[PDB]
Symmetry: C2
Subunit: 132 residues, 2 copies
């Protein structure tokens, strides 16, 4: 399965509140927010998807993402729902988790929206070449 | 010279609102907030500095930082001066950058830039963490 990473990122707006996770060699930042109002720009280093919210800013070099995977886990006694954006080394450059309110209480239709994306794009898939 | 990374992170509370930047191989996340209410924990992979706010959670493996550098830069959009603290790993790559958070372009909080220079003078423009201890 091969799909547009741009289309997919925009489609993540349907997931409601997310926990966006980016990890370096030594740090982790886990930001709470909804994906929306994405803007794109091409630079020397890559073709970027970008977001500016009140609490945080986000940039994704779409050209470096080789595969996207859906994943569930266990937290409390409840299921977690994640989407991983993997790089050439098969390491997660970005992870998106559905964000609950009180522990395990997801937003109405949120878990459904996640399954809808997984069914539409597939369990694991590779992005098509990026064109801005 | 060498200093305690723990003491340094505690001292960062004096810098007011920061912009915490963590970069992976392909993504950048920037979160706005003061470095305050830090808590430490020893995990399997090492001693971590952490923060929990409503908007974000932050974790730093202190044992992986080999060098810390103060840098004044210039913003791409605005052409205004930026003030950063970069936490380098063993590859001399920034595992975390803390920027003074600007309001309007080049606008900082009262005493904030002076506080950055004071911290820089106290720790040095480039310094190395001591073996991590809480
Ligand atoms: Zn940015
Ligand atoms: Zn966390």
């Amino acid at each position: 399965m091969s799909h547009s990473l741009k289309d997919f990122l925009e489609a993540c707006e349907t997931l409601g509140t997310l926990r966006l996770i980016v990890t370096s060699s030594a740090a982790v930042l886990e930001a709470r927010g909804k994906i929306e109002k994405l803007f794109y720009a091409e630079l020397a280093k890559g073709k970027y998807a970008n977001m500016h919210t009140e609490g945080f800013e986000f940039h994704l070099n779409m050209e470096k993402i080789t595969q996207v995977k859906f994943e569930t886990g266990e937290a409390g006694n409840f299921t977690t729902y994640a989407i991983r954006f993997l790089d050439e080394k098969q390491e997660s450059a970005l992870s998106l988790f559905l964000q609950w309110g009180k522990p395990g209480e997801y937003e109405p239709g949120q878990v459904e929206a996640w399954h809808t994306l997984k069914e539409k794009y597939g369990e694991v898939w590779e992005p098509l070449p990026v064109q801005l």
